[PDB]
Amino acid sequence: DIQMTQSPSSLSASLGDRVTISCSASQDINKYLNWYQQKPDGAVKLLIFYTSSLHSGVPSRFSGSGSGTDYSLTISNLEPEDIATYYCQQYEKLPWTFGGGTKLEVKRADAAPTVSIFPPSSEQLTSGGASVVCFLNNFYPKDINVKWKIDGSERQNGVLNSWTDQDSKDSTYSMSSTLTLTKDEYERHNSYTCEATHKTSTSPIVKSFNRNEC
Amino acid sequence: MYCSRLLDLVFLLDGSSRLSEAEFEVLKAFVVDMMERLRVSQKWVRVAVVEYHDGSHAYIGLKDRKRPSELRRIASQVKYAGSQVASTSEVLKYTLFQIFSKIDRPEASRIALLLMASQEPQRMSRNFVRYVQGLKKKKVIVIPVGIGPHANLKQIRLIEKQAPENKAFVLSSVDELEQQRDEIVSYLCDLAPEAP
Amino acid sequence: QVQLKESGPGLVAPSQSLSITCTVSGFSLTDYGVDWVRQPPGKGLEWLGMIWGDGSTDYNSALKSRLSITKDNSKSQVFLKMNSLQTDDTARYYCVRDPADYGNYDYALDYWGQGTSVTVSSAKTTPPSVYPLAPGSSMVTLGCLVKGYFPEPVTVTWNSGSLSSGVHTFPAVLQSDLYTLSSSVTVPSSTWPSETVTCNVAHPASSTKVDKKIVPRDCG
């Protein structure tokens, strides 16, 4: 199969900007290259075919160029509706193959996450389960790290993380981190701490609770 | 009607059941008749003969050094295939990448006489036009000869469109080959240069 | 207007087959090809195969001959069938039209269906356990942990939808064949705990709907 590479998977820009998304094939593909747009809601549409032809309905701010192995999709002036993921695709030879995608994101002033930690509910404990939940909300940029500690000691097993896609209204991101333990193991310790590392602070943002100070 | 010029002529015969066993003999007879009107020789007209179905079998290669009479005999003995499909795309691919992988006689003209009586499934045509364009780039003229009502007319017109000299001959049946033979030999001979 | 839409089964047990019908309008299946493309959750696109106007087909060999695409021109329907799905066949499946015009070597995926989500799993329908998240012992952030359900999706609202500006509901993660997600809400301190804040979790597959009031913790 021919391998298609989109070097940047995440591309930041400001509305009004000229944006360029690059794509390269593992071998000459003779301009047999198409570009697609997948919006945050999942809808996919064809934008450019045979390297540079615009599909019906597509506005002129989109253009495509290239030859050989290197291709580019340019958005002359970025509009809000263009925040989406873009994929290139070759048809030099079957099977058709797609690049890994380039998701556009909107730039905004850096913002530290609002961190909150929650002990397991009494209801959940009643079933022998114990999840400790930590929310890291409305931060920017998206890169962030969460560390858990039980009685001062870092804990890596039993942790599941989830990230939201960029918020359309305020351009921030949020993340959830949940540490699940059995009720006995949970009841076997006292301090539970959630630490967030993000560029907005050079010290971790820490949130904790003691199973017994309640 | 006799062609004494520098030419590499490749005969591509449709091996599908669109031609019956007896109609295929008439097609082979046309090939032999054509050879009789060409100065068969490595220095003048070289010939090749391929029967194509889903895949193909080469009976004579341009470089085969054999008497013209033995070449006519081989042609007369080509086996009837009667396949469900005769892929024009695959045989043009074979012609482009195997027969003309290298151009041994740039002083001769090259012609692919595509004798067609059927229509391949669309999926087999995916690279069709790219094969025809590749042949044009190596200066291999493609002459489609449609035979019968199942001949792929779409492909015949597409070939003519790719290059000005790719003229088509559309026949109602193999019975017309004999009637149009001298006319075809004449058109092919004129596409070739005279020896010095 | 050219349209395509998939009707899928939603769920497939490991080793069973996947059947999807793509119904199209605005063009004739005799003059166009129809392709199938899939996207595993959180991943890119994979081209699976297509069917030409004449019914001949092309398949991606990575599918190991498991795929069949057939159609009924008069009913404007195209049928995908795939043998023995495994967990890694979980994905959203799209039917997409292409010109299938070899004369112009034009095969662009020009109009896409919205797609149908397929989950391959042996899990039984299981309602979520919903737990209220109150702070341990300005604004206050509260949450609800929605754990152990199957299959996706659940809908989470706060105060029956009255609260929405400070709400963050997270994508679900598959733990042990079961899904889990959390939802948080940030509201002014003047409104909680003096007034009620409730999360509402509906899970259509289970026909279940539960409300959980967030209460200060019953600590002794």
Q: How many residues does chain B have?
A: 196
Q: CA C182, CA A163: separation in Å to the nearest integer? A: 11
What is the distance of C-alpha A60 from the center of its chain?
Answer: 28
Contact B167, B143 (CB under 8 A): yes
Contact C19, C10 (CB under 8 A): no
Residues C115 and C137 in one domain: no
Residues C36 and C103 in one domain: yes
Bridge partners, residue A159, by sequence: A179
Rg (C-alpha) for chain B, rounded Å, is 15
Bridge partners, residue C179, by sequence: C149, C174
- Single out the residue in C54, C88, C122 at which a domain terminates: C122
Resolution in angstroms, to 1 decimal, for this deposition?
A: 2.0
Contact B129, C105 (CB under 8 A): yes
Residues C84 and C110 in one domain: yes
Q: CA B40, CA B38: separation in Å to the nearest integer? A: 5
Class (C level, CATH) for A108-211: mainly beta
Distance in Å, alpha carbon of B182 to nearest chain C alpha carbon: 32
Expressed in angstroms, the distance from the first to the final Cα of chain B is: 21
Residues C131 and C109 in one domain: no
CATH of the domain at C67: 2.60.40.10
Name the phi and psi angles at A196, rounded to 5: -110, 130
CA distances from A197 to A65, A161, B166 (A): 40, 14, 70
C92 shares contact with chain A (CB less than 8 Å): yes
Q: Hey, where are the domains in chain A?
A: 1-107, 108-211
Q: In this structure, which long-range contacts are made by residues B100-103, counting pairs with CB atoms below 8 Å and at least 24 apart in sequence?
A: B100/B135, B100/B138, B100/B140, B103/B138, B103/B139
Residues C114 and C134 in one domain: no
Domain architecture of chain B: domains with CATH = 1-196 (3.40.50.410)
From C4, C142, C149, select the one nearest C80 (Cα to Cα).
Answer: C4
Residues C10 and C114 in one domain: yes
Residues C16 and C115 in one domain: yes
Rg (C-alpha) for chain A, rounded Å, is 23
What is the distance of C-alpha C12 from the center of its chain?
Answer: 13
Q: A–C: how many Cβ contacts below 8 A?
A: 135
Bridge partners, residue A178, by sequence: A133, A160
Q: CA A38, CA A44: separation in Å to the nearest integer? A: 4
Residues C118 and C27 in one domain: yes
Chain breaks after residues in chain C, where C lies over 2.5 Å from next N: 137
Residues C2 and C90 in one domain: yes
Which chains share 3+ C-beta pairs under 8 angstroms with B?
A: C
Residues C13 and C23 in one domain: yes
Rg (C-alpha) for chain C, rounded Å, is 23
Query: Which range marks the domain in which residue C18 is found?
Result: 1-122
- Single out the residue in C102, C122, C142 at which a domain terminates: C122
Expressed in angstroms, the distance from the first to the final Cα of chain C is: 66
| Distant-in-sequence, close-in-space partners of A68: CB < 8 Å, separation ≥ 6 | A28, A29
From C100, A148, C103, A58, select the one nearest B153 (Cα to Cα).
Answer: C103
**Fold equal for A1-107 and A108-211:** yes
Q: Where are the beta strands (DSSP E) in B61-120?
A: 109-116
Which chain A residue's Cα is nearest to C134?
Answer: A118
Q: CA A97, CA C60: separation in Å to the nearest integer? A: 10
Residues C95 and C16 in one domain: yes
What's the total number of domains in chain C?
A: 2
Residues C135 and C158 in one domain: yes
Q: At A88, list the tokens.
A: 């290139």
Contact B116, B155 (CB under 8 A): yes
User: Residue B121: its chain C contacts at CB < 8 A?
Assistant: 52, 54, 56
Enumerate residues 63 to 102 of chain A having a beta carbon within 8 A of any beta carbon in chain C. 87, 89, 91, 94-101
Solved with: X-ray
For A129, other C-beta atoms within 10 Å of its C-beta total 20
The topology under which CATH files domain A1-107 is: Immunoglobulin-like (2.60.40)
